[PDB]
Write a protein that binds this ligand. Structure first.
Ligand code: NA
Ligand code: NA
Ligand code: NA
Lengths: 205, 209
């Protein structure tokens, strides 16, 4: 409960049938978003044919970051990278199905991890904390907060990306969420009873 | 444009023969539309999708039991609706509120699981929805850590594993969080947001250097 696993993946594209996983960065925070270790950033080998298949937008970002040339030199396999990520996570989260996976639009990463790294996929809780869910809520409920987001960076790797995901959530914690510990038990029970009453007729049909 | 975000939210809950994206079948899809303030705009759509007798007999004991007890299995057996037909019905329904593709987030509890089945079986619907999603369970997990009394006060959900009631309870859960763990609208001023952004940028700058 006291730890969050953050992952950002890079791919040759978004297609779960055809595209390859070429980078996995992993970061651990506690439940208060304190970063517990500098993180891991693993560059996974893919063949030149797979890299030649990237579309213009993906080929361009991975060229500008230098990722593609690093992928070409790497000998790390998906199975080797999975064992490295699993051991790293277990230093802080030894028990399986206890820590959620966290990131921006993190379900996309999870799909590639479920396909390529089943042992890691099963070690993480199925629940995830999608920072972009909060982003899109703020976009509608608190538009000035949405437009005030910290600017995210250019031409950097997956590890910098996942750190900026934590920073974005730390920004929302200071702006759109109430102060901890939050409402009292009586206040929470009252709010729950209000929305139960407000949704009762719709639920009854 | 894809920079535009729709003021309406699309909510979907699915039932399946199991969680395996290779082997399991989509057998129920419920769809609900809300405005940004979580007002439900229509009673919702609930589609029972046919699945072969083999797929139903191959359900594991946990899933076979839940879909028997809810009546879903008998409904699936009686249904003649295909996934392609259900997909076109879902699209026509959503487009009454969200006509532009890639503008409305998909919303639910652990909605990435539903999205994987939609991407596999309903590619046109998958493309019409924004890739971004509002996972109410992400807020639930934040409440567990930052607001535990709100976490323990969540309204009790039904255990029926039926798609329309369950997606309505997902909206109700987010409405609960809106009143408990989110600040009052309109929220921070521009100046307050700038200060908070500067604080976290300063806080993470060395790590990102
Ligand atoms: Na990402
Ligand atoms: Na990235
Ligand atoms: Na569900």
């Amino acid at each position: 409960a006291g730890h969050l696993v953050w992952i950002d993946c890079e791919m040759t594209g978004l297609d779960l049938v055809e595209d390859k996983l070429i980078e996995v960065a992993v970061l651990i925070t506690d439940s208060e978003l304190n970063v517990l270790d500098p993180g891991l950033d693993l560059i996974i080998s893919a063949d030149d044919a797979a890299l030649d298949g990237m579309n213009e937008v993906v080929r361009t970002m991975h060229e500008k970051s230098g990722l593609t040339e690093e992928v070409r030199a790497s000998t790390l396999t998906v199975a080797e990278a999975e064992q490295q990520v699993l051991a790293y996570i277990k230093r802080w989260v030894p028990e399986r199905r206890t820590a959620p996976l966290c990131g921006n639009s993190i379900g996309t990463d999870r799909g590639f991890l479920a396909r390529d790294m089943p042992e890691l996929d099963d070690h993480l809780h199925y629940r995830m904390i999608d920072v972009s869910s909060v982003k899109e809520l703020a976009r509608r409920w608190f538009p000035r907060v949405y437009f005030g987001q910290p600017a995210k960076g250019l031409a950097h790797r997956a590890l910098a990306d996942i750190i900026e995901s934590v920073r974005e959530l730390a920004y929302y914690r200071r702006t759109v969420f109430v102060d901890s510990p939050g409402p009292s038990s009586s206040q929470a029970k009252k709010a729950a009873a209000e929305v139960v009453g407000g949704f009762a007729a719709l639920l009854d049909g």
